[PDB]
Design a protein around this ligand. Structure first.
Ligand SMILES: CCCCCCCCCCCCCCCCCC(=O)OC[C@H](COP(=O)([O-])OCC(O)COP(=O)([O-])OC[C@@H](COC(=O)CCCCCCCCCCCCCCCCC)OC(=O)CCCCCCCCCCCCCCCCC)OC(=O)CCCCCCCCCCCCCCCCC
Ligand SMILES: CCCCCCCCCCCCCCCCCC(=O)OC[C@H](COP(=O)([O-])OCC(O)COP(=O)([O-])OC[C@@H](COC(=O)CCCCCCCCCCCCCCCCC)OC(=O)CCCCCCCCCCCCCCCCC)OC(=O)CCCCCCCCCCCCCCCCC
Ligand SMILES: CC(C)=CCC/C(C)=C/CC/C(C)=C/CC/C(C)=C/CC/C(C)=C/CC/C(C)=C/CC/C(C)=C/CC/C(C)=C/CC/C(C)=C/CC1=C(C)C(=O)c2ccccc2C1=O
Ligand SMILES: CCCCCCCCCCCCCCCC(=O)O[C@H](COC(=O)CCCCCCC[C@@H](C)CCCCCCCCC)COP(=O)(O)O[C@H]1[C@H](O)[C@H](O)[C@H](O)[C@@H](O)[C@@H]1O
Ligand SMILES: CCCCCCCCCCCCCCCC(=O)O[C@H](COC(=O)CCCCCCC[C@@H](C)CCCCCCCCC)COP(=O)(O)O[C@H]1[C@H](O)[C@H](O)[C@H](O)[C@@H](O)[C@@H]1O
Ligand SMILES: CCCCCCCC/C=C\CCCCCCCC(=O)OC[C@H](COP(=O)(O)OCCN)OC(=O)CCCCCCCCCCCCCCC
Ligand code: HEC
Ligand code: HEC
Ligand SMILES: *C[C@@H](COC(=O)CCCCCCCCCCCCCCC)OC(=O)CCCCCCCC[C@@H](C)CCCCCCCC
Ligand SMILES: CCCCCCCCCCCCCCCC(=O)OC[C@H](C)OC(=O)CCCCCCCC[C@@H](C)CCCCCCCC
Ligand SMILES: *C(=O)CCCCCCCCCCCCCCC
Ligand code: FES
Ligand SMILES: [Cu+2]
Ligand SMILES: [Cu+2]
Lengths: 50, 139, 158, 223, 160, 312, 163, 107, 92
């Protein structure tokens, strides 16, 4: 588009780090003894209940 | 910003039509009347687009045609002082880490860690917001 | 991978005194001896009960329960051919609910042993349960089902 | 009771026959046999909600109960009838006794708890870690009947404390100590969990040291 | 410090019964300043030697480790000057970025100390953050030689 | 040719399954025609290489073909509208909801196995004076006069005045063909009759799918309260024999171990089976008595062992 | 846990049930209840003995076939009763955290597991020597008594050991 | 100083017989008994001992932070290696004194 | 413009003539700036050796040994890559 930078370039830096760290804690369910999320990716309701 | 507003106006029209037709055809011809989940979601995405498009239309009527929005505009026309764009900053990663601490505190139901993460999020957001306003040390 | 193929929770025995003997088509559950002992041993010549539950696995049945006798001369009063995709509860384990409170075939196949040999709590004593399908040694324990502590005499310091 | 046994069998059939066959014999390598576990074990497990477990892992976690009090009683009665075993304590009316399980003596309960319970749980009833993926849950959520039945039966990796080993009086004293330690306010400020050294060091390094360093940055200069 | 003494509970001994050799608890940690020694005890891999009719238990390993830690800490400036050659009278401080190798080494040492401290706390970490106790122990064991290297490299490059 | 072109769709055993298979064949024919023409277009424009004979002259550089765009945005609408009309007419026979089912099966699916109730049987030719039990549908209204507080709360219950641990939505019957982990359940149905299935889940959502019915439904915990039409009908089952059935929604860990069978037997065989089940007998015993293999012949209750490398 | 009077009471095998652990101490008839002043010092010594406390564990009969025994300790167990010192073989903390259905005696001080099924040898953590196994039996009247003394020093190891 | 005005170091066994009900009649060392007396029987003794322990933790933490400051800033070079050395001895002494301090009330 | 340009005379003393250069580390003259690559190579080799040796111990499981092997292999691979590249003049 001919722009020099994005509208809020400290915000897109935050977006990447929110992506990275948010992703890591999701994958981090594996290191727990029980495992990661066993329910499907869709994560239907009663199966995801406590 | 005429086209920018018109995009959201078109989206709002479509989503309003979708919400209305869904609500009607679910109030009748459904097992239990109005679904109340799809209906509300469609109504409030219509609201999303309506808010954004209304603001864009207000701006379009308040603004004279910009070089960006003007066909047959030369580069020199838009040449000038662009505004402040934040240079290098390490506050975003700290905000992300603080929010991750709060998130793990929520997942592993640890109220102490939730409180610590919220305090860190407040601190990191304060740092990011004040980054370019903190004055020199007065000694 | 603490939830893999070798998992603690899945590989657990019941927290009950009776042993489990799955050998043979009919599986033995909570097999123990009710032999209340007042001293070191349960003296020979005293009858003590052999509690267990025989659960049939295959519905196609092994309801014989021929002899199930070993050193001790185990006799099966009120014997019946119960196990057919079901349970045979020989006796009344401490706390057992009288689900019927009536004489259904008199006793429910109570197994009792005249020891002919001292036994004591904490030891394992081999019993050969033999159905028409086959025979299995079980190594039954002694269980004090629901009896409270017997008062130990007070100690006189010396 | 006849109808209670019928209801217990009904719930068992549509809840857990996939893990202990209709005969309650343990399904090989999915669940242990319920013969002899007893009404007490059934009550503890289902009331804590721990048991209707939807995964095989290091330890079955606790979770919201999947059956109400009457249904838990039905399950327990059915399992007691099938196997026969320990029974959950009950009061004069017939309901599961909870207040009655609060032993009068609390110093004795605390000594017994420290000798036997604190071994893995904590000084004051908090949780503790175990060999590999296991853990001892914090006792703050357990009601007196659940604590008594948890002693009476060994759910998983907890030693089974028979009545002969811990007579109902000693078990009641331990229950009283557990409840007192759970409901006792922390004297001397916010009790950082119950673990002393680790929470306290973290709180130092965060609160006290951030305060000190920020105050130093305020007072001094940057250069 | 007064506000902390008021609002935060520190060492509530009343919850902790009097010492008896038989009674125990799951936590069993020292204050944070000795948590690193305790974590060294936990992580060091049970290596015992048995000379002729004698034993050299795993405790001596940690004793020697602490001896080495203190010796190196006390003798660093002399080690630093032997390594670099600096025998000049220095009255102007160096920025940690301006001294990368020393900054990298300090970061590596702090990483090792933090790893040891969290290894001592591994019991409570495993309990609260649902990680296997064996998993935390072996994370500490591997990381006490991996994390120091990672932090050294990262700190050196960060300073540059 | 039809079997191969069906892309591995089993030949149905019900009129609904046959009609669905025919619709699938037609839709696959249409999809393959569209794919063939589009792939032909791609592999024919791949013949527009940069010929070395192309001198310093760029291509036609046209873009922006309004009539062609209109044609190729009109025809897809026609194709999908025809497919939608066929879809609607086929859908109409998805649940005809005939108010006179010939046999009603209460399919309650709990965590990691099935149970079939035989709620009601009413043959059109005239037979089977049979009915469901429903004494055991007992509610869990937590309507105690008072709760923890001294007075005032008089709590009724969280949901519609009841507790989530209600199970009243579940229905129970005299003849229950419960499936054990070591015994695959075999729901036996009469051939040639209309079979209704009243679908429910004891604990969690999962999915009843007989692959040869060419139809699946999701047994939900409380379909009536979730506005789900769990109950669905099958007009007929022509072919007899044993047909595998599977669980087709996430159940938990043992989601792949919920296989069952729907053994379709003759009406006289069903007479004998139901009589022998009214008499104290198990499903396997009744099957053997009617001279049909007792255990599921299309599937086995495979090992409860966590896997092959587990040390028994 | 009685506060002071009769702190230690004789024990019987029936008191423990499969998958149960009990901390026991070396009580003598002479070391009667704590009522007297001569007693309540012997009893205090018993309680405060570092190497005194032992854990008596009841191995399940089903799992009795997985037991592997040490040299000179094959007959130490009384049927399905195994008595192992509570003092961890590494630095001497009590190893009280007994896990049944895994038969692992875990120490909280430094997270060392000892396999109770086999002779209580360390299968994880800093410990490298097995817990000393007490020989147990039943005397007259059926009360549990020690059938001897530890065949090895029981506390944590030291230089003059293993000879 | 305030703590020593109320602390009694001894293993002499005693039954509490204090105010703290959850520990009554239990054999304990006089050290533990007097620590409990500081906590409960003495006005502000709990606060004094808590601020003492918090001061110990802050002492260790601030020593560590100061060590980091000097090490990373190179304040130990030629003129001040002796200062670094004595500071390291000070840190070791602080660690071990904190060890003995939280070991004092037999717990 | 409310800042004054700084100038400093740092007492210097190796003559930073065989080792790192300002082009590679801008502040080479201002402090300890280069560790011999032999130190890092030998340290990585010893770390990998320690990880491998930690396999020998009292632990029935072998997931731990496989993790040790993986990490030691990664360390050895990194050290080998660095050594080979430096030997060949940072090629490939
Ligand atoms: C749900 C999750 C909540 C997400 C809320 C944040 C999303 C907002 C993003 C879009 C807003 C516009 C924008 O670009 O933000 C500018 C800015 C990005 O700055 P930039 O990219 O560098 O560009 C310069 C700005 O454009 C220059 O503009 P600016 O820097 O001056 O921004 C002005 C306002 C920008 O306008 C706003 O963002 C409105 C703030 C509303 C958010 C309130 C939180 C509501 C959620 C609570 C319930 C959950 O800045 C402020 O002064 C007020 C910020 C107050 C944020 C408070 C958040 C605390 C959360 C913890 C609450 C604890 C209670 C729960 C327990 O974003 C922020 O400051 C928000 C920080 C992100 C917080 C995430 C929390 C995790
Ligand atoms: C591995 C890679 C993944 C790492 C994941 C961890 C990410 C988070 C740690 C990095 C955050 C700090 C950073 O990026 O370095 C900035 C800083 C360089 O700043 P600079 O702009 O170049 O300074 C030039 C002049 O000094 C003048 O420049 P200046 O004008 O910008 O002022 C100096 C700058 C420099 O300020 C700082 O250095 C503050 C350091 C904050 C560290 C936060 C630790 C979070 C724990 C992470 C665990 C790893 O300004 C300030 O903000 C001074 C005020 C202090 C604010 C303290 C705020 C605490 C926020 C807590 C929020 C809760 C978050 C919990 C999560 O880097 C450092 O010197 C610290 C080393 C990195 C910390 C390692 C943490 C362990
Ligand atoms: C030897 C050793 C370190 C072994 C490994 C064990 C270990 C520490 C594992 C990590 C722990 C974590 C972070 C678990 C969450 C799940 C997980 C691993 C997610 C992936 C990690 C990852 C790379 C995430 C990306 C984003 C990111 C950096 C997230 C970090 C989130 C967190 C938890 C930040 C804070 C770090 C933290 C406080 C960790 C716990 C450490 C300690 C010693 C807490 C002490 C403590 C405890 C334990 C209390 O209970 C308590 C109760 C009441 C008041 C105070 C406290 C208190 O201070
Ligand atoms: C200058 C100093 C400033 C210090 C701030 C002081 C904070 C004041 C807190 C409130 C007043 C005092 C409360 C005293 C009473 C009290 O103790 O408070 C409990 C609460 O406790 C919790 O849950 C935590 C709730 C979350 C809020 C408090 C978190 C503050 C932390 C973050 C401060 C330390 C800094 C750490 C930083 C960490 C980040 C590191 C990067 C409340 O009861 P409860 O909730 O039920 O505790 C359960 C028993 O019941 C049950 O048996 C038992 O078994 C347990 O389950 C127990 O939790
Ligand atoms: C700054 C400190 C951070 C640490 C730095 C060090 C980084 C190096 C990480 C080294 C990873 C080594 C992991 C191996 C560990 C190992 O060997 O143990 C295993 C368990 O595998 C696992 O999950 C391991 C997962 C490893 C995850 C790595 C986590 C990295 C995190 C901690 C980084 C975030 C740091 C955040 C810092 C916050 C700021 C602090 C201020 C098996 O246990 P077990 O449980 O007994 O399994 C039995 C079977 O064996 C048996 O078959 C079967 O029968 C079963 O029974 C099963 O139980
Ligand atoms: C990418 C490819 C990675 C590999 C992908 C395959 C992963 C499969 C893992 C688990 C599957 C579930 C089975 C779970 C059961 C384990 C299998 C088994 O049956 O083996 C028995 C022993 C305990 O049985 P035990 O009686 O107590 O002792 C026996 C006495 N002699 O476990 C063992 O040997 C452990 C062997 C299992 C493989 C090791 C997994 C860790 C790999 C870590 C790699 C990280 C590399 C780091 C890089 C930076
Ligand atoms: C490791 C040895 C061990 C000892 C000894 C022990 N516990 Fe536990 N405790 C555990 C473990 C492991 C669990 C987890 C059981 C489960 O999840 O099924 C547990 C669970 C519990 C629970 C359930 C709490 C809840 O909310 O679910 C209570 C209550 C409890 N224990 C109390 C006690 C009491 C009272 C004693 C009295 C001596 C005791 N424990 C002794 C380890 C132990
Ligand atoms: C495989 C999933 C699973 C299901 C679902 C399940 N169980 Fe269990 N059960 C187990 C496992 C595994 C154990 C042993 C480990 C544990 O309890 O965490 C166990 C143990 C028990 C115990 C304790 C046994 C003892 O000796 O202490 C009781 C009681 C019990 N189950 C009853 C029930 C009841 C009642 C239900 C239905 C409400 C049920 N279970 C559902 C697998 C299951
Ligand atoms: C059960 C077996 C079988 O599975 C495996 O063996 C796969 C193991 C893959 C290797 C995992 C190594 C651990 C991650 C190291 C990341 C770098 C750390 C140094 C920097 C701090 O294996 C198991 O026992 C468990 C298998 C599950 C492993 C899950 C690992 C999840 C990773 C998660 C903790 C996030 C990693 C953070 C990466 C940070 C790098 C980007 C910034
Ligand atoms: C704290 C410092 C620890 C100092 C240990 C002093 C050990 C003295 C006794 C060694 C011995 O011979 O006993 C028998 C031996 C156990 O069995 C063997 O013969 C083969 C063993 C192969 C492994 C050798 C590893 C040696 C490493 C040490 C040399 C390094 C120390 C640093
Ligand atoms: C243990 O209880 C969980 C076992 C999980 C089995 C599946 C293995 C997943 C591994 C994927 C890779 C993890 C992340 C890799 C980061 C480098
Ligand atoms: S003190 Fe027990 S293992 Fe170290
Ligand atoms: Cu399924
Ligand atoms: Cu299902």
């Amino acid at each position: 588009i001919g722009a020099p930078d994005v509208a809020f370039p400290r915000l897109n830096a935050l977006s990447f780090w929110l992506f990275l760290f948010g992703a890591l804690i999701a994958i981090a369910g594996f290191i727990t003894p029980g495992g990661a999320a066993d329910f499907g990716w869709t994560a239907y309701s009663p199966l995801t209940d406590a | 910003m005429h086209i920018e507003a018109r995009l959201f106006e078109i989206l709002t029209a479509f989503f309003a039509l979708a919400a209305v037709v869904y609500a009607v055809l679910t109030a009748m011809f459904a097992t239990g009347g109005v679904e109340w989940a799809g209906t509300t979601a469609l109504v409030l995405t219509t609201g999303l687009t309506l808010i954004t498009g209304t603001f864009f239309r207000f701006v379009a009527r308040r603004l004279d045609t910009r070089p960006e929005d003007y066909e047959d505009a030369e580069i020199s026309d838009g040449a000038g002082e662009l505004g402040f764009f934040a240079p290098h900053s390490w506050w975003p990663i700290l905000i992300s880490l603080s929010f991750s601490t709060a998130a793990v505190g929520a997942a592993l139901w640890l109220p102490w860690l939730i409180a610590a993460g919220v305090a860190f999020v407040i601190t990191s957001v304060c740092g990011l917001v004040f980054e370019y306003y903190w004055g020199p040390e007065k000694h | 991978c603490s939830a893999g193929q070798i998992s603690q929770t899945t590989t657990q025995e019941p927290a009950v005194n009776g042993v489990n003997a799955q050998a043979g088509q009919v599986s033995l559950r909570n097999v123990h001896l009710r032999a209340p002992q007042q001293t070191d041993y349960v003296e020979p010549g005293t009858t003590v009960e052999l509690l267990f539950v025989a659960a049939n696995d295959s519905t196609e049945s092994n309801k014989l329960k021929s002899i199930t006798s070993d050193v001790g001369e185990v006799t099966l009063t009120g014997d019946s051919t119960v196990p057919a995709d079901g349970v045979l509860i020989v006796g009344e384990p401490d706390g057992q609910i009288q689900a019927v409170e009536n004489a259904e075939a008199a006793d429910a196949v109570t197994a009792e042993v005249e020891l002919t040999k001292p036994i004591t709590n904490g030891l394992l004593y081999d019993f050969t349960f033999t159905f028409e399908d086959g025979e299995t040694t079980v190594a039954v324990p002694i269980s004090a089902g629901e009896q409270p502590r017997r008062p130990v005499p007070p100690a006189g310091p010396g | 009771q006849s109808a209670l046994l019928r209801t217990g069998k009904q719930l068992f059939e549509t809840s857990c026959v996939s893990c202990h066959g209709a005969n309650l014999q343990g399904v090989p390598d999915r669940g242990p046999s319920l013969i002899g576990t007893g009404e007490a074990a059934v009550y503890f497990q289902v009331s804590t909600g721990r048991m209707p477990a939807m995964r095989g892992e290091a330890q079955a976690p606790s979770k919201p109960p999947h059956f109400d009090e009457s249904q838990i009683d039905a399950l327990g009665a059915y399992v007691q009838a099938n196997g026969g075993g320990p029974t959950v304590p009950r009061d004069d009316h017939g309901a599961v006794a909870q207040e009655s399980l609060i032993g009068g003596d609390v110093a004795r309960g605390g000594d017994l708890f420290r000798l036997n319970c604190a071994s893995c749980h904590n000084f004051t009833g908090k949780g503790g870690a175990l060999s590999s993926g296991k853990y001892a849950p914090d006792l703050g959520d357990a009601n007196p009947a659940q604590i008594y039945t948890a002693m009476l039966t060994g759910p998983q990796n907890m030693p089974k404390f028979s009545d002969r080993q811990l007579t109902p009086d000693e078990k009641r004293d331990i229950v009283a100590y557990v409840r007192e330690s759970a409901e006792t306010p922390s004297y001397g400020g916010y009790g950082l969990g119950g673990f002393g050294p680790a929470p306290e060091g973290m709180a130092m390094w965060i609160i006290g040291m951030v305060a000190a360093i920020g105050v130093a940055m305020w007072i001094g200069s940057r250069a | 410090l007064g506000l902390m003494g008021g609002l935060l509970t520190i060492n509530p001994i009343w919850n902790l019964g009097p010492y008896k050799p038989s009674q125990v608890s799951a936590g069993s940690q020292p204050d944070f300043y000795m948590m690193w020694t305790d974590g060294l005890i936990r992580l060091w891999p049970a290596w015992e030697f048995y000379p002729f009719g004698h034993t050299i238990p795993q405790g001596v390993w940690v004793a020697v480790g602490m001896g080495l830690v203190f010796a190196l800490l006390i003798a660093y400036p002399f080690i630093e000057k032997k390594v670099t050659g600096d025998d000049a009278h220095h009255n102007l401080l160096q920025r940690p970025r301006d001294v990368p190798v020393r900054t990298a080494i300090g970061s590596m040492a702090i990483a090792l100390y933090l790893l040891l401290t969290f290894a001592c706390m591994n019991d409570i970490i495993a309990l609260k953050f649902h990680i296997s106790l064996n998993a935390t122990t072996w994370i500490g064991r591997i990381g006490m030689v991996v994390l120091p290297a990672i932090v050294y490299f990262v700190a050196y490059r960060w300073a540059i | 040719w039809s079997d191969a072109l069906a892309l591995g769709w089993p030949t149905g055993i019900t009129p609904e399954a046959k009609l669905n298979r025919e619709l699938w064949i037609g839709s696959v024919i249409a999809s393959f025609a569209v794919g063939a023409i589009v792939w032909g277009l791609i592999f024919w424009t791949s013949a527009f290489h940069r010929k070395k004979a192309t001198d310093t002259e760029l291509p036609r550089q046209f873009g922006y073909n309004m009539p062609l765009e209109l044609t190729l945005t009109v025809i897809p609408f026609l194709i999908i509208s025809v497919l939608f009309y066929f879809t609607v007419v086929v859908q109409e026979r998805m649940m005809h909801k005939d108010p006179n089912p010939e046999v009603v099966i209460d399919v309650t699916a709990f965590q990691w196995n099935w149970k079939f109730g035989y709620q009601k049987i009413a043959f059109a030719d005239g037979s089977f004076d049979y009915d469901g039990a429903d004494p055991e549908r007992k509610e869990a209204m937590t309507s105690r006069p008072e709760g923890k507080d001294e007075h005032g709360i008089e709590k009724v219950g969280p949901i519609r005045g009841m507790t989530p641990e209600d199970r009243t939505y579940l229905n129970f019957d005299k003849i229950e063909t419960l499936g054990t982990s070591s015994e695959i359940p075999v729901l036996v149905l009469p051939a040639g009759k209309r079979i209704e299935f009243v679908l429910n889940s004891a604990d969690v959502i999962h999915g009843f799918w007989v692959p040869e019915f060419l139809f699946k439904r999701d047994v939900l915990p409380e379909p009536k309260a979730n506005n789900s039409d769990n109950v669905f009908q099958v007009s007929e089952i022509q072919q007899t024999g044993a047909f595998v059935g599977r669980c087709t929604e996430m159940c938990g860990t043992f989601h792949a171990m919920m296989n069952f069978e729907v053994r379709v037997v003759e009406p006289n065989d069903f007479k004998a089976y139901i009589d022998q089940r009214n008499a104290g007998k198990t499903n396997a015993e009744a099957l053997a008595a009617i001279n049909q293999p007792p255990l599921a012949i299309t599937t086995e209750p495979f090992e409860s062992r966590r896997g092959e490398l587990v040390p028994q | 846990g009685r506060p002071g009077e009769s702190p230690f009471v004789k024990m019987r095998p029936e008191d423990i049930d499969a998958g149960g652990m009990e901390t026991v101490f070396p009580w003598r008839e002479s070391d009667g209840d704590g009522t007297t002043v001569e007693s309540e010092h012997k009893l205090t010594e018993i309680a405060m003995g570092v190497r005194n406390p032992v854990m008596l564990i009841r191995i399940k009969p089903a799992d009795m076939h997985r037991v592997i025994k040490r040299k000179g300790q094959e007959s130490f167990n009384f049927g399905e009763l195994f008595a192992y010192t509570k003092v961890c073989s590494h630095l001497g903390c009590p190893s009280s955290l007994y896990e049944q259905q895994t038969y692992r005696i875990l120490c909280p001080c430094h997270q060392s597991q000892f396999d109770a099924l086999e002779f209580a040898k360390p299968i994880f953590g800093p410990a490298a020597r097995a817990l000393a196994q007490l020989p147990i039996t039943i005397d007259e009247d059926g009360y549990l008594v020690a059938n001897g003394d530890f065949v090895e020093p029981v506390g944590p190891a030291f230089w003059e050991r293993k000879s | 100083v305030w703590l020593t005005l109320f602390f009694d170091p001894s293993m002499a066994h005693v039954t509490y017989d204090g105010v703290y009900q959850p520990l009554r009649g239990v054999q304990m060392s006089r050290a533990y008994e007097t620590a409990l007396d500081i906590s409960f029987e003495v006005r502000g003794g709990l606060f004094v001992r808590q601020v003492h322990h918090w001061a110990a933790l802050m002492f260790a933490a601030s020593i560590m932070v100061h060590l980091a400051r000097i090490f990373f800033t190179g304040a130990f070079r030629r003129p001040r290696e002796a200062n670094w050395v004595i500071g390291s001895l000070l840190l070791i002494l602080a660690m071990f004194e904190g060890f003995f301090g939280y070991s004092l009330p037999d717990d | 413009m409310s800042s004054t340009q700084d100038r400093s005379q740092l007492d210097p003393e190796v003559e930073r003539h065989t080792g790192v250069d300002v082009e590679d580390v801008p502040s080479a003259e201002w402090g300890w700036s280069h560790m011999p690559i032999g130190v890092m190579h030998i340290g990585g080799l010893l770390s990998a050796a320690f990880l491998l040796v930690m396999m020998r111990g009292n632990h029935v499981g072998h997931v731990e040994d496989w993790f040790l092997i993986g990490f030691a292999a990664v360390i050895v691979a990194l050290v080998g890559r660095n050594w080979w590249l430096r030997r060949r003049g940072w090629i490939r």
